[PDB]
Write a structure and sequence with these properties.
This is part of a larger assembly, with chains A (169 residues), B (220 residues), C (159 residues) and D (296 residues). Chain B has 220 residues and is α+β, with helices and mostly antiparallel strands. Helices cover 21% and strands 18% of the residues of chain B. The chains are: A alpha+beta (169), B alpha+beta (220), C alpha+beta (159), D alpha+beta (296). Chain D binds three RNA strands through α1, α2, α3, β1 and β2. Chain A: Keywords: Acetylation, Cytoplasm, Methylation, Nucleus, Ribonucleoprotein, Ribosomal protein, RNA-binding, rRNA-binding.
Chain lengths: 169, 220, 159, 296
RNA sequence: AAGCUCGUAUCAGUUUUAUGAGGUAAAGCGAAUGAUUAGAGGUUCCGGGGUCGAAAUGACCUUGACCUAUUCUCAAACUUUAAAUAUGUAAGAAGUCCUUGUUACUUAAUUGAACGUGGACAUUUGAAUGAAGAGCUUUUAGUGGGCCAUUUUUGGUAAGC
RNA sequence: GAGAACAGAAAUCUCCAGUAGAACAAAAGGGUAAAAGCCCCCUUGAUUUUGAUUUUCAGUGUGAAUACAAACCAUGAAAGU
RNA sequence: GGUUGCGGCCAUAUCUACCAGAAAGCACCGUUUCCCGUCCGAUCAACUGUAGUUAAGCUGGUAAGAGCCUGACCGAGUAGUGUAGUGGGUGACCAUACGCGAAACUCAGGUGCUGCAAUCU
């Protein structure tokens, strides 16, 4: 029973939570921009904390969403940073996962002091076909519990391909 | 200084509790309601006597605390702590008011007659109907005289008429004595803390059979 | 110190029927209102335009006008020792027909048909209504229903 | 498969369910009120809506008025009945939409008695023109577009079917800024391009572009055209003749019903489950208590 | 007080029938919101404290918060529900039925809407009871400090307040 | 709630559940979910003309509000507002 | 009888969890030249019904299921209430007469019906 119960990446979300705006933020944006080929999008802080120097609507951070073979491309070159090794967690209860990296140069980008060094959060978000049902306008249904993604199925997929293990729990 | 209870005996005013509107009230003098052997199964204390009001009046938290102390002390003197479960089935929620018109001399320090006579809180009181139960005890059947005596001794510390009535029905609960017995025989009962849970014929058989295997199990 | 605004004392009135909030149903708008039709007034808090004042809640009037979105209702209002003719521009969400005169017109049709049938067959319909009359004589049989004797019960507490 | 949400008994008690078409996700009652409600001083005049819906494989254009017991259909045209006029592939595209609108217009006017007058545009060049009125005679049949939930956008097929209806003769008030060929800067229309969209110029342009760029995609796509001997030079003539025959005879010859209502009902009720009985529920309960008590 | 137009016209501090409106009394909170007594079973890497411990989302212990199902008790400014009394409308001649004119309004349309012609149904003509006449107008006096009782009810300990 | 470098009880991202437990300038109350809330686009009907109506009420005034007409505009695919 | 479109009344229709579905339809599904829209052809827009599957959505069934609906000499003619008395009672409050009359609890059953059109071994 696996005709269309095949698990595939909905998308990959690349995030950098730079803590301020100006040079650091726009440079992080450039990093994402030439990493993805897609014009990234800048998010703003949703309230004020004052321990960190962030407040409302200050253009705090950057992210971008990628899909398809470019998504799994960026994913494998970024997973090779973690050496095909995750934890028992890093995997959501719903069937997604993610991992953080430092020194993004590990994904093939020169130092280039006109950019500088940034970390990243990668989040892989998964699905089985028939997710239009939950996103389309007309007749927006749910997905049945058979066809809902799950942590176990997602881990089994990520294991049986990618040559990846779950060291460190 | 705490003017008498004849001044607040009768349900003259509407109920007036601690709210966002009326705030800044004094605490109750009765704060404990369950005492004796509270961590006791229903099967241990088959008796009950109730102290029932026979008047539509309102009682004070002070009187409730006093009656509580008196009754507990008598019960504990004779029968012991592990012998009874005194529950106070009434709660002082109605707030009482004072205008507080001064007491030295109203010639120049006038206090303004009845201008602005709305009062501030004085204390707390329970509004008690006729037939409304007060002071359940639930002992064993052989502590009957003691419980009657203790409730009758508490009875002096309230206004109005109160009656001490015997009960069937395992008196924490409803469900008369033989019916409780036949259900406990059939296995329709579980001992949850201080009060039981009863079988229903409504929920899923999953839950009913994991929670009540003895009922239709054919081994006993 | 007092407050006597338009929607004063209207809290529970213009509440909205538990589990009947929002999304007015469209038979309300498809219902047709001709001049002379009797209509009951029952405001809807969800439609803030064209509302009645709280006086006219549950009052039943007659239509004098018909407009785009509304109808004009006539009411007779007590002011002292008299009644006064009040005209209300109210939207149709606050308005419903009257099953009273509906039933009256049914009885009209039946009275006409009955009078016709009688003019054919047999005169003296007696087509008015009469109140509930006292019931006639009858015979109440035992034959299996013997009278069961009841006694007053003694006092018991069961508490 | 999940529990911690656990809709409680109180929640389920005081939950107000939406209307059924809303729960189904098929209707906007906001739009429906705004669109169905009539000026109450007309007292009886139906407000007719041209309901244009797009499934996969079919376009569904209906002329509907509203009533309490339920809406009533004056006329209804589909795309799947175009093969008797000469369209057999791409019968859910912009051009089939135009032709379906043309057909509902002509069919409606036929049965309504207003076909000799308000004959509509038979010189289709994309020039934006509504159906002006004829003095010394009736007015045209006014009918309002019901889209539903698909997004108002410039280049779309609800608008194709509208343009077809208006050309076919119906009065359908609309603006020209959602027909394709409308420029975001200069507020004017490109009716030559629009005529191309009517006559498949974009589909034909794509067939040419594949057939001289990529041939495997052209082989799997459009193979109905290859098999029916059609190529990308006479799609205009196809839709032209389809328009002409739609204008010739729109009178809705239906199917032949092929094992009629009773035979269908039998073959359905065979596989449609009976529900259950109360005694049967009691018996299954008895069986569960006996098995999960005695255990053989 | 003067009358005026009429003489069963139309009416009514009343019931019944039909149809509505209401959110008080009651009740309810193992239903929402707030208040509230008691234990019982789960629960954290994500509470505190101590133990076996160089560390381990490593092992154990008490209690608090949480959750689950129970549980005693409440609300003038809470409520799913929901009275009695009080309340609106109607109970046909200015009515119902059929055919058919006007319109500059409306309709896709002599389709609708309004007012109508013409014809048909009358004395159990469309519940009850009563109707010491019904309807209409003008003008003008005194008054514009109130008090009591039953019942509902606020303030106040209460008051011949 | 579960997940993701620095990231921690709270910073940004993703999914889940979520009948409103939020917000709607300002009291409180009502009302509102492909919304009356949040975001975006276009705008000035917050215009003109003078009348009928509802509340307060003497059935006066003011204040506010309602529903139309004759115009002119905005909006949108349009119904409509 | 099923399905689609458009609906009416708006839970007997909602929710949790399992199981089935022939035909047709719906659906997922395939690609991005053109209109169109996004950080992302995911949503939206368009093009093919071609390459594929009922996996989901969808419909129906199941559950001593939760919820909701109806009924009940079920509680209960109880609570409450209109009217009455030179009635009882220190009072608080109560009974009685002529009347109207609930909610919770309990039990039983039930779990969408239906209009217009089009189509389906």
């Amino acid at each position: 029973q696996n005709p269309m119960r095949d698990l595939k990446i909905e998308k990959l979300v690349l995030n950098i939570s730079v803590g301020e705006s100006g040079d650091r933020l726009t440079r992080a944006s450039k990093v994402l921009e030439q990493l993805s080929g897609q014009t990234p999008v800048q998010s703003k802080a949703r309230y004020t904390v004052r321990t960190f120097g962030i407040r409302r609507n200050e253009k705090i951070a950057v992210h971008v969403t990628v899909r398809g073979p470019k998504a799994e491309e960026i994913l494998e070159r970024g997973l090779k940073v973690k050496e095909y090794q995750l934890r028992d967690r890093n995997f959501s209860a719903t069937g997604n996962f993610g991992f953080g990296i430092d020194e993004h140069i590990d994904l093939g980008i020169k130092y280039d002091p006109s950019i500088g060094i940034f970390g990243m959060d990668f989040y892989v978000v998964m699905n089985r076909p028939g997710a239009r049902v939950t996103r389309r306008k007309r007749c927006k249904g749910t997905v049945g519990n058979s066809h809902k993604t799950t942590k176990e199925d997602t881990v089994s997929w990520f294991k049986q391909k990618y040559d990846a293990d779950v060291l460190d729990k | 200084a705490r003017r008498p209870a004849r001044c607040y005996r009768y349900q003259k005013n509407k109920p007036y509790p601690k709210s966002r509107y009326n705030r800044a009230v004094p605490d109750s003098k009765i704060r404990i309601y369950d005492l004796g052997k509270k961590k006791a199964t229903v099967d241990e204390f088959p008796l009950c006597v109730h102290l029932v009001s026979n008047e539509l009046e309102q009682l004070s938290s002070e009187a409730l605390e006093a009656a509580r102390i008196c009754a507990n002390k008598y019960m504990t003197t004779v029968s012991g702590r592990d012998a009874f479960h005194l529950r106070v089935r009434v709660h002082p929620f109605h707030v009482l008011r004072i205008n507080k018109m001064l007491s030295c001399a109203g010639a120049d320090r006038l206090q303004q007659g009845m201008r602005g006579a709305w009062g501030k809180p004085h204390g707390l009181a329970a509004r008690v109907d006729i037939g409304q139960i007060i002071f359940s005890v639930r002992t064993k059947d052989s502590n009957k005289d003691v419980v009657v005596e203790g409730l009758r001794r508490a009875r002096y510390k309230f206004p109005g008429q109160q009656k001490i009535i015997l009960s069937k029905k395992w008196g924490f609960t409803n469900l008369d004595r033989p019916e409780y017995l036949k259900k406990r025989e059939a296995g329709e009962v579980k001992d949850d803390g201080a009060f039981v849970k009863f079988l229903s014929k409504k929920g899923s058989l999953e839950n009913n059979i994991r929670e009540f295997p003895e009922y239709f199990a054919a081994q006993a | 110190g007092k407050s006597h605004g338009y929607r004063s004392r209207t809290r529970y009135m213009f509440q909205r029927d538990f589990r009947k909030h929002g999304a007015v149903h469209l038979s309300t708008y498809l219902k047709v209102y001709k001049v002379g039709d009797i209509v009951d007034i029952k405001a809807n808090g969800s439609i803030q335009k064209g509302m009645p004042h709280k006086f006219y809640q549950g009052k039943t009037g007659v239509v004098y006008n018909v407009t785009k979105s509304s109808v004009g209702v006539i009411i007779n209002k007590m002011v002292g020792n008299r009644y006064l003719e009040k005209r209300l521009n109210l939207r149709v969400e606050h308005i419903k027909h009257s099953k009273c005169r509906q039933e009256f017109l049914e009885r009209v049709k039946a009275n006409a048909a009955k009078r016709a049938e009688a003019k054919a067959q047999g005169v003296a319909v007696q087509l008015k209504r009469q109140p509930a009359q006292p019931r006639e004589s009858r015979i109440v049989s035992t034959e299996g229903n013997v009278p069961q004797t009841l006694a007053p019960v003694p006092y018991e507490t069961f508490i | 498969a999940f529990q911690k949400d656990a809709k409680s008994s109180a929640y389920s008690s005081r939950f107000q369910t939406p209307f059924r078409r809303r729960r189904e996700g098929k209707t906007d009652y906001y739009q429906r009120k705004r669109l169905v409600t009539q000026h109450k001083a007309k007292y009886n005049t139906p407000k007719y809506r041209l309901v244009v819906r797009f499934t996969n494989k079919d376009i569904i254009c209906q002329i509907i008025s509203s009533t309490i017991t339920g809406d009533v259909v004056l006329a209804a045209a589909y795309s799947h009945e175009l093969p008797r006029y000469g369209i057999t592939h791409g019968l859910t595209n912009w051009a089939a939409a135009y032709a379906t609108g043309l057909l509902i217009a002509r069919r409606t006017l036929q049965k309504l008695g207003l076909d000799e007058t308000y004959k509509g545009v038979e010189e289709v060049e994309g020039e934006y023109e509504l159906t002006e009125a004829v003095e010394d005679g009736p007015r045209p049949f006014k009918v309002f577009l019901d889209i539903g939930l698909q997004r108002t956008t410039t280049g779309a097929r609800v608008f194709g079917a509208l343009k077809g209806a208006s050309d076919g003769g119906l009065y359908v008030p609309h603006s020209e800024n959602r027909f394709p060929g409308w420029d975001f800067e200069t507020e004017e229309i490109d009716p030559e391009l629009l005529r191309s969209y009517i006559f498949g110029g974009h589909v034909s342009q794509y067939m040419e572009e594949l057939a001289d760029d990529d041939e495997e995609r052209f082989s799997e796509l459009f193979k109905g055209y290859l098999a029916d001997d059609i190529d990308a030079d006479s799609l205009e003539d196809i839709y032209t003749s389809a328009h002409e025959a739609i204008r010739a005879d729109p009178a809705f010859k239906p199917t032949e019903k092929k094992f009629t209502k009773e035979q269908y009902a039998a073959e359905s009720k065979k596989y449609r489950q009976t529900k259950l009985s109360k005694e049967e529920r009691a018996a299954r309960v008895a069986a569960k208590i006996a098995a999960l008590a005695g255990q053989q």
